[PDB]
Amino acid sequence: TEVRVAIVGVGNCASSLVQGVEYYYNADDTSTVPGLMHVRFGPYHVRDVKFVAAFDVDAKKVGFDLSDAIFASENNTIKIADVAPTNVIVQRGPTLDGIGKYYADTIELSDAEPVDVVQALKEAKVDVLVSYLPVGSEEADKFYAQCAIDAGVAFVNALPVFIASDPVWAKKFTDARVPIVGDDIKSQVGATITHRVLAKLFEDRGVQLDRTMQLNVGGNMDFLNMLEDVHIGPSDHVGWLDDRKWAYVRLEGRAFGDVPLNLEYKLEVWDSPNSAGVIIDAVRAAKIAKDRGIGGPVIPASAYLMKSPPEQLPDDIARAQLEEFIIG
Amino acid sequence: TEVRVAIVGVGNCASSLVQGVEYYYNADDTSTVPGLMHVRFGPYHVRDVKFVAAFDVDAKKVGFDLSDAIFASENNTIKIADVAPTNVIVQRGPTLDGIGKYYADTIELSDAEPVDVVQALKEAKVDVLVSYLPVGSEEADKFYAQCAIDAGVAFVNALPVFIASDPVWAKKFTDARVPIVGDDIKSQVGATITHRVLAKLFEDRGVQLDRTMQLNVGGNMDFLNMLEDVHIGPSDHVGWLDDRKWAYVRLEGRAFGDVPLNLEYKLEVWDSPNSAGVIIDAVRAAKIAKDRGIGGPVIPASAYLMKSPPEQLPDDIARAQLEEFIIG
Amino acid sequence: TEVRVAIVGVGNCASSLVQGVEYYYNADDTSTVPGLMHVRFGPYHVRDVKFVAAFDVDAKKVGFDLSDAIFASENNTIKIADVAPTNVIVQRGPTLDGIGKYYADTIELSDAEPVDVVQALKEAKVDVLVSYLPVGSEEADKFYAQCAIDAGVAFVNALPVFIASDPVWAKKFTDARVPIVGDDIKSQVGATITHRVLAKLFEDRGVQLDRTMQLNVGGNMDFLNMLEDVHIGPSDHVGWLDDRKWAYVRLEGRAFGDVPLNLEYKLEVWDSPNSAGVIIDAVRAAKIAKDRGIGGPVIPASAYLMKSPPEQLPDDIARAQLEEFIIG
Amino acid sequence: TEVRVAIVGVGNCASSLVQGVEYYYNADDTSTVPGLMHVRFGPYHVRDVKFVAAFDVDAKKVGFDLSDAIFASENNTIKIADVAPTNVIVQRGPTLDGIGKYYADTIELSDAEPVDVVQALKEAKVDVLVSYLPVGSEEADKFYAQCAIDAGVAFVNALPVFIASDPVWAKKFTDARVPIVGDDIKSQVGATITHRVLAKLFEDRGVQLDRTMQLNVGGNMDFLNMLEDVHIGPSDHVGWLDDRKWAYVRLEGRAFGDVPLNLEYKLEVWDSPNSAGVIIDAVRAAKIAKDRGIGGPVIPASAYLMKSPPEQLPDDIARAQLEEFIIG
Ligand SMILES: NC(=O)c1ccc[n+]([C@@H]2O[C@H](COP(=O)([O-])OP(=O)(O)OC[C@H]3O[C@@H](n4cnc5c(N)ncnc54)[C@H](O)[C@@H]3O)[C@@H](O)[C@H]2O)c1
Numbered sequence A, B, C, D: 001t002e003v004r005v006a007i008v009g010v011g012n013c014a015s016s017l018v019q020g021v022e023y024y025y026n027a028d029d030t031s032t033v034p035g036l037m038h039v040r041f042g043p044y045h046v047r048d049v050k051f052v053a054a055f056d057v058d059a060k061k062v063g064f065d066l067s068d069a070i071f072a073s074e075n076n077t078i079k080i081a082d083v084a085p086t087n088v089i090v091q092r093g094p095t096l097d098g099i100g101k102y103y104a105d106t107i108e109l110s111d112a113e114p115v116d117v118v119q120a121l122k123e124a125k126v127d128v129l130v131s132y133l134p135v136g137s138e139e140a141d142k143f144y145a146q147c148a149i150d151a152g153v154a155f156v157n158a159l160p161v162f163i164a165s166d167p168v169w170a171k172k173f174t175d176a177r178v179p180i181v182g183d184d185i186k187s188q189v190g191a192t193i194t195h196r197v198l199a200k201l202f203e204d205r206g207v208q209l210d211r212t213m214q215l216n217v218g219g220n221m222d223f224l225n226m227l228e229d230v231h232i233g234p235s236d237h238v239g240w241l242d243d244r245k246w247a248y249v250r251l252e253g254r255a256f257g258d259v260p261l262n263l264e265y266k267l268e269v270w271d272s273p274n275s276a277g278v279i280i281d282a283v284r285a286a287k288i289a290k291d292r293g294i295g296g297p298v299i300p301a302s303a304y305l306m307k308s309p310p311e312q313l314p315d316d317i318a319r320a321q322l323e324e325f326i327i328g
């Protein structure tokens, strides 16, 4: 009944995921938990999620037990639960394009030789591989995706590298009978969706949005890495913010009579945990597809849990389709 | 082709309405204007809206031309258009419960004797009477509603006094074959709808809203009059704000792992003009119902343009039903 | 070496004071603590402050040990330290005008008969009586001030009732050789001083401040009680804020060329603790004056620690004069 | 009685300066104007400031009348006054290091051959040269400073290139009997001074400032150019902001009992005009020093009007010393 999970990139998101499973390890499956569609997704309780392997390139992570690696190097997300030794030692994966200038100047790459990822996946009997590679790691993400396909392991693509949403890659998974949920994991409530909802509000109520500004500040490596009319994008890295992300947004519009109507807000979130619940749902959905031997992109799951899914669908419809998929 | 309009309560809302018609008097009916469903609602262009009568109780308004009365006494909304003399002299209506302690201490009641409103409506051949009485004026609003019924004049109830939404009053209008659109005119984008949309966002995304605060400040008589877990309501009267209304709102919730997620915002609007467009649509809808000899609450119009309609309907559905009503 | 303290009004401020002494009971006198001029003020270490008596009128406080009374009824300030039983039982003081409509509707007055305060003070051998009566309690504050004079007990007036700053009362204390520090205890950083500093900034830099607004919200009885161009004052009571006080302030000015220059801010503080340190310094200053047999207002202490002192003096000068007073 | 002024760098600051003189051309010298120490500084009325020459490198400015050049290319500050043709044609200055990558990719350099600046200054009989070179233009600013010295023209250094504050350069001006006021012109109320005052407030009131963040956004070339614990610095370029600069700042501290005390604010200013008044005072001070034949840094003026003066002095003292200098 377990879901054997392997993690690529033991960063802040990996930390929120491992801690998250620990946090809700004893949750009642008849109750509702924030950030999770179901404490028990299909047959899988959160506790059924077992971490059996992990890959990284940082000297302070490779060779260390997963339980330590999640709190090492630049990892700095909020600690919600203690994580006992897992006995899972982080292995050396191929760096490829996963480490940009800012990262390289911040960490030291492990001296260990990159292992044979496909063999590593098979030896660990992994069911689902979750990829947390830094933004821009196209070669690296596609490399890991390929290993997953070759090892017959389901893939959950958490970063904005088009794989599940690239017909070419969708076909590779389909033909191999390997499931994939992916291309940019969603956050529960982040700046993007908040701005979308409000912009829609203006529009639906007849208020013309003339100008908009979105300033984002954070203090983690994901933010640092991304640093490397309408305005939007990472603004400034603020060390003491750690894994938190603050969004300062201003909407300026005109209502009846061209009368000015403004709205300014600040959204405060802990970035990584904002997606841990979503990932946990993705992981189990990918597991279910695998139990059924259905390869290719898991359509309902990707539409509801990812920002760049194979096929676009309204959230509620995507949600309903995902609920049907679960029941099977 | 004209819509003969009479105004009860020449305050800030009345000012935005009269100025609004002037502002869009030459608008192209194939274009879209903020705050208006249609420049030409059915057969009625904004310009077809003619002000033929008005009633008030303030010594600085009664006896004055409507064009002056809208800028008199405590009226202080934003001026978007010059208004030439209308030759419509503001008449003395019965005060009843339209003037509370705060208002009474602020203005001087007109020495003139209250006129016979029913006769006044008939003599002016009014088609639609729009009521802008202060909040709490139940006896006064029902009195004016009654006059409207007796004169065979359609009624648009802009304040939170239940008439269209009170089965008893709905029946009175129905039986008299007089249309009524009403009970609290909507604003395009105000604090209420903004908070609703965001609260829904949290809920839909699995974020538990634990605490919420909504502080409102303004500088007009409507605000002054209203001054006479969850928190909400008029907070403080700020003189120099005039007709503007600022809402400071904070939402505190918990996302996956009980991680704190907050959102704080400030909405800046010019309160009265925020409903002028809505009123203009209500007025013409009421006119159309009258042209058809259909009495009682105009269901589609009230559902879409009012906060407390006879029957609740999702905005988009109410909107679609209103579009069908227009075509007839 | 102890400073025998009695408290009038066991509310939020009393709670922050008692907890405060506990919190810094073991502080190093060569270190600096936020909110305190000296861990050891003259000969008195914070720990030398002993609570020996207290008076209230609330049924949930009178008859209870001080350690419980500080956390009873509507008290809701932040808890910074555990407070062990003190064996000091809260006595029934005369209500007089200390309980307004809002308070009366919130609490139940103790059935106990008001005691003879003068006798109570003498029996407890009190050195300093600190008054935390609600705003507006003039008769009550002057009554307690009188008892203090009669018992030869130094008085620290924390509320805005003019006593130390009223020549008539200043003379009563002087003639009795009883010290008094008083009339509205200062906060370290509150809305008032923050606005003062910024308004001064504008002025000194040649920016004309045209309009200003200050909105305050809180969730304690002090705030509730106070609820009973320029804008300023208590705006709205927000239950879940508890003892916290949030100030939303906006300054609008004109710089060179009449160019608009604005500044908007939000100050978040825990109201009661914001003055506990100040009170602790006041208490010891009053003790020192008593050791010297010097009656009347302690000038340096009042100028630096109170909002409405007998004599106004620039903070730094008042501070320097207070430092000289300490050395003696 | 005129002050012959030449401008190096016809950007936003140059625009605010030229418009500023026009705006207050008819000001009463017995009145006080925001941003100016005196409408009449010594013998010089604002109107005595005459623009007689200007230098730039942009193809859309060189060869154009100053009155047009101030509103050309990327200039986008607020327009406070119409500026009639001046008959002063912008000349081609040597680019040197005044145009970085971001600027070069934004504008096209003039095809004209750089002129002999020293000769140009002499031919125009310039009294004061104001330098508005972009940040980082060390070689260019020192080149222009040298020309000024050689032409016997007073220099006002508005950018952060150390000249007046570099003993070596201070001596060059002194030995040549040429005055210099300089190194980074002050703003009336900008983010820096606002943060300074508040940080000082915390400190003086016993509140320990633990963390601070300062985010700045703007929409002009100065901001774009600058883009090329504690946090501070240019955060993000927001096109539609134009010459406006918004500073989002948050201060987090601990008050008595280690209780959290926070302050968050947003300062909205029009960046360039925020220094026009200061420059006008600097220009006349430099003129007075020249009338007296006193070379080297004008100490009082630099201490009060510049961020990096030769010698540091408290603002009020520097202000008083400057007032004495004026009287002479
Ligand atoms: N945190 C969120 O809410 C959220 C939401 C959507 C998308 N994402 C994306 O998910 C990713 C995860 O971010 P974090 O989790 O915030 O990032 P992170 O920077 O903390 O960690 C990335 C990890 O990958 C490791 N890594 C780098 N190259 C590697 C390679 N070749 N092989 C194996 N490991 C390698 C790094 O050493 C590091 O431990 C980012 O791309 C982010 O943009 C995050």
Ligand SMILES: NC(=O)c1ccc[n+]([C@@H]2O[C@H](COP(=O)([O-])OP(=O)(O)OC[C@H]3O[C@@H](n4cnc5c(N)ncnc54)[C@H](O)[C@@H]3O)[C@@H](O)[C@H]2O)c1
Pocket (backbone or CB within 6 Å): B008, B009, B010, B011, B012, B013, B014, B055, B056, B057, B058, B075, B093, B094, B095, B096, B097, B098, B099, B131, B132, B133, B134, B135, B140, B158, B159, B160, B184, B185, B186, B187, B220, B221, B222, B225, B271, B272, B273, B274, B275
């Ligand atoms: N402004 C908005 O966006 C908006 C939205 C929804 C509802 N409303 C409601 O609409 C009403 C109109 O507010 P304003 O228009 O903002 O208010 P207002 O205070 O400016 O004007 C009300 C007017 O009614 C007059 N009046 C009082 N008693 C009267 C009587 N017996 N007979 C005739 N006239 C009388 C007053 O003298 C005054 O001119 C308020 O009740 C308000 O709450 C306004």
Ligand SMILES: NC(=O)c1ccc[n+]([C@@H]2O[C@H](COP(=O)([O-])OP(=O)(O)OC[C@H]3O[C@@H](n4cnc5c(N)ncnc54)[C@H](O)[C@@H]3O)[C@@H](O)[C@H]2O)c1
Pocket (backbone or CB within 6 Å): C008, C009, C010, C011, C012, C013, C014, C055, C056, C057, C058, C075, C093, C094, C095, C096, C097, C098, C099, C131, C132, C133, C134, C135, C140, C158, C159, C160, C184, C185, C186, C187, C220, C221, C222, C225, C271, C272, C273, C274, C275
């Ligand atoms: N908290 C601050 O930072 C601050 C700063 C300056 C001034 N003050 C003033 O100090 C006072 C203390 O406020 P809290 O401490 O915040 O107020 P509070 O409302 O929490 O407590 C006042 C207490 O006085 C008791 N009381 C009322 N009448 C009494 C009487 N006749 N005899 C004895 N006790 C009586 C009440 O039952 C209550 O326990 C207020 O007047 C407040 O405005 C507070």
Ligand SMILES: NC(=O)c1ccc[n+]([C@@H]2O[C@H](COP(=O)([O-])OP(=O)(O)OC[C@H]3O[C@@H](n4cnc5c(N)ncnc54)[C@H](O)[C@@H]3O)[C@@H](O)[C@H]2O)c1
Pocket (backbone or CB within 6 Å): D008, D009, D010, D011, D012, D013, D014, D055, D056, D057, D058, D075, D093, D094, D095, D096, D097, D098, D099, D131, D132, D133, D134, D135, D140, D158, D159, D160, D184, D185, D186, D187, D220, D221, D222, D225, D271, D272, D273, D274, D275
């Ligand atoms: N605006 C303020 O409040 C303020 C306050 C302090 C300091 N400053 C500094 O003053 C300077 C002026 O900024 P703006 O005025 O905002 O900048 P800007 O970018 O608008 O204009 C600089 C001008 O210099 C011209 N220039 C560039 N290289 C040149 C060269 N070699 N010779 C002649 N002209 C050349 C450019 O083409 C442009 O017109 C900046 O360095 C800024 O940082 C501005």
Ligand SMILES: C[As](C)(=O)[O-]
Pocket (backbone or CB within 6 Å): A029, A030, A031, A032, A037, A038, A039, A040
């Ligand atoms: C069955 As359930 C509590 O996950 O919706």
Ligand SMILES: C[As](C)(=O)[O-]
Pocket (backbone or CB within 6 Å): B029, B030, B031, B032, B037, B038, B039, B040
């Ligand atoms: C016909 As139309 C421009 O009002 O939607």
Ligand SMILES: C[As](C)(=O)[O-]
Pocket (backbone or CB within 6 Å): C029, C030, C031, C032, C037, C038, C039, C040
């Ligand atoms: C002597 As001390 C540390 O209180 O200033």
Ligand SMILES: C[As](C)(=O)[O-]
Pocket (backbone or CB within 6 Å): D029, D030, D031, D032, D037, D038, D039, D040
């Ligand atoms: C003499 As004056 C009005 O500039 O201070």
Ligand SMILES: [Zn+2]
Pocket (backbone or CB within 6 Å): A012, A013, A222, A271, A272
């Ligand atoms: Zn992350």
Ligand SMILES: [Zn+2]
Pocket (backbone or CB within 6 Å): B012, B013, B222, B271, B272
């Ligand atoms: Zn209104």
Ligand SMILES: [Zn+2]
Pocket (backbone or CB within 6 Å): C012, C013, C222, C271, C272
């Ligand atoms: Zn208090």
Ligand SMILES: [Zn+2]
Pocket (backbone or CB within 6 Å): D012, D013, D222, D271, D272
């Ligand atoms: Zn500038």
